[PDB]
Design a protein around this ligand. Structure first.
Ligand SMILES: O=c1ccn([C@H]2C[C@H](O)[C@@H](COP(=O)(O)NP(=O)(O)OP(=O)(O)O)O2)c(=O)[nH]1
Ligand SMILES: O=c1ccn([C@H]2C[C@H](O)[C@@H](COP(=O)(O)NP(=O)(O)OP(=O)(O)O)O2)c(=O)[nH]1
Ligand SMILES: O=c1ccn([C@H]2C[C@H](O)[C@@H](COP(=O)(O)NP(=O)(O)OP(=O)(O)O)O2)c(=O)[nH]1
Ligand code: NI
Ligand code: NI
Lengths: 149, 149, 149
C-alpha cells in the first residue's frame, strides 16, 4: 500500500517523524577527534522494491559540528538495524579541554569536571542526528556493449 | 506546471544553468585549513511537493581541491536562501605560504604579496562551486510494526 | 528499452553486478594519509535522459576505513570512463609502519617488508570499492520570479 513499515528493535529506539524522516540515536556516545563509529538507531524499515532509502546527514548538526555522516544507502527490503556511519572529522591537535560539545557545537557543562580531548562531541540517546529520505531506484538489466546506440 | 521557480535574493545572486543546475557563489570568501562555513548563493527555490532538491558537490572542484561540500537536502517548498555547506578539509599542518589556491587548486598570484596558511582556498563571487539536482521523494505514512509482512 | 548499456574500456575493467550495482577498481593504487585520487573503473555507461547515476560509497569499506568517496553524479548520456573520487582522510600524523591496510582495514602482510606511512591503504585491481545507484532526475525550465505563488 502507500505506507512504510517501521520496526523498533529496542526500548531505546524512537519512531521517525516527518519532507525527510528525523532519525534518533538509540545510544549515548562520545567521539574523539578523528574517531569513526556506527551509531545504532535500534530501528529497522522494510523499503519496497523500486525504492532506495537514504540515511543522510542533518543540516543543523553537520553544518555546525565536525560530525560527518557518510550517507547510507538502505536497499529495498533490508530489515537490519539502521546504523549511522559517522566520523568526528575534527583534527586531532593533541590539545585538551574540560568541555564536551553537543550536536550544536555548544559546550557541555560538567558538574563533575573531566579532561577531554579538544574537539570531542557527545551524542545523547534520543537526539536528532540524521534523517531518512526515500527515493525511487532504477534497476535495468545490464548489456555488454562494444559501442552505444 | 513543468517549471521550477527561482528567486534572486540579492544583486550578488546568479541564475542557475543546465543535467544538473550549476550554482554560483554570491560572496568572495577565504577558507583556512579545516575551516567550516556556509556560503550564501543569494538564491531561493520553490520545489514542488513530491520532490527533494540536492545541493551537491561539483566534480571538478571537489576532485581537484580539499573543498568538501556536504550535500544539502532542499525540502519541497523551502523558500530560504540556499547555502553551501562547505569545509576546507585540508590538514592544518601549521605551515605558511604566499599563495592562495583557487577552486582549481592553482596558485593565485598576488600583486600585493601576503602570508597565508598552507592549504587555503579562495572562492570568488560568481564562481561555479556547486550544483542543484532535483529528484522525486517518497513520503508514505509510518506504521509501527512488530514484524514485517 | 528497460536495459542499461555498459561499455568496458579496458581488459582491466569489470562488469557491474546487482539493488545497487557493485563497481570494481581497474587499477592497484596506494593512498597515503590525506592523499586524493581518481580511481579509474575503465567502465562507461549510457544513462538515458530523465535519469542521473550515483557513483556512491560502499558501506563496508567506508565505515571500516578512512577511504572517503565523494559521490559522483553521472549525468544522463555521459559516456566517459567512470572514476572514483576518493580521499584517504586518515590524519597525517607523520608516524611509520610496515603494514598497508586493505579495504577491510586489516593489515597486509608483506613477504618483502617495507616502510609505509601510518594510515595508508591499498586498493587492489578488481576490488569492490564503490557502487552505482541510478535515480530519476527532474529537469524543469527555470523562471525568474520576484515572489513565489
Ligand atoms: O550508513 C549506512 C550504510 C549502509 N547501511 C545498511 C543499509 C544497506 O542495506 C546495507 C549495505 O548496503 P550498501 O549498498 O550501502 N553497501 P554493500 O555493497 O555492502 O551492500 P550490498 O553488498 O548488499 O550491495 O547496510 C546502514 O544502515 N547505514
Ligand atoms: O547544505 C544545506 C543543507 C540544508 N539546506 C536547507 C534546505 C533545507 O530545507 C533546510 C534543512 O533541511 P534538512 O532536511 O537538510 N535538515 P533539518 O532536519 O534541520 O530540516 P527539517 O528539520 O526541516 O527536516 O536547510 C541548505 O540550504 N544547504
Ligand atoms: O566522482 C565522480 C564525479 C563525476 N564523474 C563524471 C560524471 C559526470 O558526467 C561528470 C561531471 O559531472 P558533475 O555534474 O558531477 N560536475 P560538472 O559541473 O563538472 O559537470 P557539468 O559541467 O557537465 O555539469 O564526471 C565521475 O565519473 N566521478
Ligand atoms: Ni549523497
Ligand atoms: Ni580530515
Amino acid at each position: 500500500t502507500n505506507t512504510l513499515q517501521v520496526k523498533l528493535l529496542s526500548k531505546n529506539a524512537r519512531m521517525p517523524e516527518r519532507a525527510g524522516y528525523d532519525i534518533f540515536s538509540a545510544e549515548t556516545v562520545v567521539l574523539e577527534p578523528q574517531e569513526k563509529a556506527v551509531i545504532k538507531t535500534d530501528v529497522a524499515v522494510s523499503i519496497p522494491e523500486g525504492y532506495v532509502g537514504l540515511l543522510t546527514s542533518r543540516s543543523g548538526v553537520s553544518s555546525k559540528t565536525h560530525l560527518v555522516i557518510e550517507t547510507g544507502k538502505i536497499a529495498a527490503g533490508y530489515h537490519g538495524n539502521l546504523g549511522i556511519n559517522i566520523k568526528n572529522d575534527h583534527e586531532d591537535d593533541k590539545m585538551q579541554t574540560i568541555f564536551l560539545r553537543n550536536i550544536d557545537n555548544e559546550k557541555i557543562f560538567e558538574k563533575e569536571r573531566h579532561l577531554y580531548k579538544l574537539g570531542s562531541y557527545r551524542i545523547e540517546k534520543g537526539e536528532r542526528i540524521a534523517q531518512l529520505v526515500i527515493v525511487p531506484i532504477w534497476t535495468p538489466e545490464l548489456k555488454q556493449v562494444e559501442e552505444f546506440e
